[PDB]
Design an enzyme around this catalytic site. Structure first.
Site, PDB file in Angstrom:
ATOM      1  N   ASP B 130      -5.229   2.647   8.505  1.00 41.62           N
ATOM      2  CA  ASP B 130      -6.505   1.974   8.300  1.00 41.62           C
ATOM      3  C   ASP B 130      -7.187   1.740   9.640  1.00 41.62           C
ATOM      4  O   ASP B 130      -6.530   1.613  10.675  1.00 41.62           O
ATOM      5  CB  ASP B 130      -6.373   0.649   7.563  1.00 41.62           C
ATOM      6  N   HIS B 180       0.178   4.832   4.818  1.00 40.55           N
ATOM      7  CA  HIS B 180       0.215   4.473   3.404  1.00 40.55           C
ATOM      8  C   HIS B 180      -0.782   5.283   2.577  1.00 40.55           C
ATOM      9  O   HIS B 180      -1.766   5.808   3.102  1.00 40.55           O
ATOM     10  CB  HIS B 180       0.033   2.965   3.235  1.00 40.55           C
ATOM     11  N   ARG B 190      -7.762  -0.824 -12.508  1.00 41.49           N
ATOM     12  CA  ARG B 190      -7.139  -1.676 -11.512  1.00 41.49           C
ATOM     13  C   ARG B 190      -8.178  -2.060 -10.463  1.00 41.49           C
ATOM     14  O   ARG B 190      -8.831  -1.184  -9.903  1.00 41.49           O
ATOM     15  CB  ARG B 190      -5.984  -0.927 -10.839  1.00 41.49           C
TER      16      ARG B 190
END
Lengths: 197, 198
Positions: B130, B180, B190
């Site tokens: 990120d 990730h 979701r």
């Protein structure tokens, strides 16, 4: 005339043979078999530079006497910043890709040499570095030129001492590798530190 | 009139009672005994928000219908919640970060958005580092009841994290050490609140 520190990348091949550790150099294309050590979680020690690199770097800094909360000189102050940029992007960045799940190196924040002596130990307070990753190269010889010294990883509860000449430590700058230097008890200890984003 | 999402910090005390998980709220001054879990090395799961926060956040995003085209998200700033989020991060999250990560001081917020995964998603969720020092991921809706599968694979840790509880947060390093990818859902929807903090 023999190649100097300054001659990268003009005299790349000769520079590499003179200045990069033969073990690092021989694994540039295949780090899978390179002999690096995970000294604590996500912190690696590995051969990077030759004794000749380390000796000449110290000579340049000693001669410039431009020492500056720690006693250091930036690579740019002795005109070695472009050489360093080349080292980082060409040699270190692929190794980082290998160690850290393909992380891409963006830019160099700082590169400097630190000289610890008996008058100038620094405060030795723990810190997060201003970097994504930090490189720390030992430039001079433990026992011969200084005693004690080294590095404490606070989170890892791990003390690292007696780093070999031309060997590098790499670790996260922020968040996950809170750290401080350890005091020396004699002589002088020189390190090359770079903060990389 | 009852306090809303927007009323932070004007109606701080009422906001906190309504929106912050009581366990988080009661430990704001001493995280030593707070019930958080290290789910893998240096990745923590912990209660942060109430069901009412989660429900209202989803309502605001559903009603605004400002979703990126069809991964599908809306920035908090697009629905005027950026100053409230800034308050949450600097006042509530940052002290917890100081506790978890050796006194690391939060500098600034890069991004804050809600992601809506549904069955229209056509292409893959690729692995990434990120753009952040740390990433916050809050589950806004209920695994099993509202969606199946989904979750998050921590590739370096070789750890799959699924079935986060409503209003519970995951925190992890953004760069270098927590590579990730999100894993697809197989039914329903979701919703997650993600924030990239420097």
């Amino acid at each position: 005339t023999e190649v100097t520190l300054y001659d990268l990348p003009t005299r790349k091949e000769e520079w590499e043979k003179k200045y990069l550790h033969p073990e690092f150099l021989s694994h540039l294309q295949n780090f899978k078999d390179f002999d690096y050590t995970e000294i604590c979680n996500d912190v690696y020690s590995f051969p990077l530079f030759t004794p000749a690199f380390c000796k000449e770097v110290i000579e340049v800094m000693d001669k410039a006497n431009l020492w500056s909360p720690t006693q250091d000189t930036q690579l740019y102050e002795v005109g070695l910043d472009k050489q360093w940029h080349y080292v980082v992007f060409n040699y270190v960045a692929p190794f980082v890709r290998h160690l850290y799940n393909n992380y891409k190196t963006k830019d160099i924040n700082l590169a400097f040499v630190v000289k610890y002596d008996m008058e100038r130990q620094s405060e030795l307070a723990p810190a997060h570095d201003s970097s994504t990753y930090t490189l720390n190269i030992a430039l001079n010889e433990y026992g011969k030129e200084y005693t004690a010294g080294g590095c404490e990883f606070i989170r890892h509860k791990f003390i690292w001492q007696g780093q070999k000449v031309g060997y590098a430590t790499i670790h996260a700058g922020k968040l996950l590798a809170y750290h401080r230097a350890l005091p020396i008890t004699s002589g002088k200890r020189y390190i090359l530190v770079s903060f990389v984003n």
